[PDB]
From Swiss-Prot, chains C, D:
Organism: Chlamydomonas reinhardtii (Chlamydomonas smithii)
Protein name in UniProt: Flagellar WD repeat-containing protein Pf20
Subcellular location: Cell projection, Cilium, Flagellum
Subunit architecture: Inter-microtubule bridges in flagella.
Amino acid sequence: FPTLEVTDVYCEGLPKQLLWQLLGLNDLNHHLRTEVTATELRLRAAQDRGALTTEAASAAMRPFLMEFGTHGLGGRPRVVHVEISNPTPLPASWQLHSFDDPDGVELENWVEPGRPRTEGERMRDLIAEYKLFEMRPRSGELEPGARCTVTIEFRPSVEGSFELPVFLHITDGKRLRLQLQAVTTPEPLQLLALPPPLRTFRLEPVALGERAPPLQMYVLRNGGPAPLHWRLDTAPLAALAEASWGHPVLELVGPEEGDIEEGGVAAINWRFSPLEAKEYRVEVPVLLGDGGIEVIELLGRGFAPPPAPPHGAAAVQLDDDTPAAALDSVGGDAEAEAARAAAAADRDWITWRGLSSAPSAGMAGRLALVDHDLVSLGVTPVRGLTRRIIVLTNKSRYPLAFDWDLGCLAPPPLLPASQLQLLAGRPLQGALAISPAAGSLEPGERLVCRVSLHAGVTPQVFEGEVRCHVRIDDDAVAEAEAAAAAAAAAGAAAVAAELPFVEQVEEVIAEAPVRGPPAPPPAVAAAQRASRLRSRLPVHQYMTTAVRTRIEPLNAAFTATMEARTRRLADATRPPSWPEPQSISVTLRGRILDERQLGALRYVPPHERAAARAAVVAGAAWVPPAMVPF
Amino acid sequence: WSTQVFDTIQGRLQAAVDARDPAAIESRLKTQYDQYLHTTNTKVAVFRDVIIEQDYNPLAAADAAIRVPTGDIRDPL
Amino acid sequence: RKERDFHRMHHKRVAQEKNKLLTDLRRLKEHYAKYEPTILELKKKYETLM
Amino acid sequence: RKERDFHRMHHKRVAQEKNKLLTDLRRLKEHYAKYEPTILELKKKYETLM
């Protein structure tokens, strides 16, 4: 069956993992990949002969939520670039259809849809009226392996909520409904980033007797409205501890409260220390500045590790990563691997088949490209210095200033081995650095940037986001213009050398007869006449003085046309270049693991178990020793 | 209607009237009018619809006129 | 086929709108019929009060 | 095309009838907005009388 796949999605100032999670593209890719499509045949039959209706189709088609969240009124519209490709060899023709929207039918003196009298259809009609939700390509067709680069944009100009259902409608294949859900708040009301995978955070299963449970990072984003003041009530966790014979479980490490700026990132570290193999469902509230719940459920399980051998009989040291045997070896429990797979689908973007971890969409209009987005730092030892390289390319013909920022990944004001206590209270428990902090870059120049992580003593799993800000280099462009001006001055000096002391009349004092400008040569006069006759005012719009005096509205129209023609010059004269500074972002995920955990492969994902075993058996990660204090 | 019909026809009228050089227009009209003047001065009389279309062919002036094609109309639909 | 389906749905929609307008027109006729007796009643009460 | 024309004229005639109802509604609304100020003035006189 000719199907489609979403390879990647690009949006301004939002992590690619977060965008994929918010759109729920895992389920979309799965459904578009495999389905018998029993009822879709009936759906196509009803689409034929015009039997289908939007409401019934939505009720029977199991819509998928395209969540755009909340947008402050008057804020910048949000754009979503989705790359659609054909995994199947058969060429795929697809037609985004929605019966409310026009279906390629010519309207001639047909009254627009009347007063709906039902607020759902009314909201649909306001969306249609004010172009709130628009997908540019509409219907398309793709050869096997092609990329369509579809764009869907939302315009936060109206107040209130808006839900618009459209459906993909592949010509021969499945037809899935997407419900674009957004709310535009005229007033600032904090709403934390609340994707369904983040609401129920699937904690990675951990060893029952682990000496130091791995810190697990949870990232909160403000969203559209004003900055969010969050406070997490530890009382349910305290109740859990009291129930668990007074042992700390699901402990919060960071601050209990905080103030995320608009479109910001705040990281909270959890320690999951279990006592049983049972599920540990714990529900915690999030009190915002204004009244709110935003409750978060944490789920984890017990690893039930193989019994630790006595020192006498220990496995000597000097199994395949891919198979499910690896998952079973990482946790003998039947449901431990199920929880691990759920957590992988929740957070590990690599395991998702569709995602490409490439710049993909957004080729046009982006100042620069990171060659490889969504970069994963490998599993690292306790005090490990792990490096990766990311190359940035300037597509713009203009020089670009490149600055590097860390949202929650900032180093404390690499790290000295003795004085690692500075890492206390820091979400990463490591020091991220990039070799170019801020560098200029010429057009078409590719720069290598080394991202290096120096980890601390606390085992951790980080999935952070690092921002790179690209702006047009005003200094460089001004220098170029100044060089051009200097060249022009040199040319003027050369012309002066050619013609010594050309006279220029400084001023005029009482020239008794009025003297006009010198007459041009007749050829130049003819050329100027032809130039004037070009851009001649249109015949039907030129009102003579007599007609203007006779008819006032014609005089007003003539004045308006003069004003319009004067205005037309200003837009041309304005230099349309210098686009807005653009912030790109790359997600980095890594596993700071203890030596015992690495040796036993306790928490390495199956995707990287081969690399973990390599790093254990043969030293593959550096451990900067520095100098001992004593 | 404006964009589909009137904007198109005026845009095609322009870049043709604009393309026509003023000097060429003056020379063309001058050749025509001097041909008419010469036939008026030589021949005893001038008649419409009676010309020999050999010495003086006024319809060549109408032939040398800007022609603009047609596209589509929204109002008539 | 696209045109016939389009016209079918909009024919149904405008028929529904016409029915709603008929009901609203009946209610408006009721209210307007309520209007005119009020003038007479107010006039008689005005006379009695004065 | 036959089906399209059938649905076209059904939809169009229904739309025309809806427009006619709207015009009639406008006419009655004007005709009784003519009367309403008299009710308002009688109300004012009534209040002054109390």
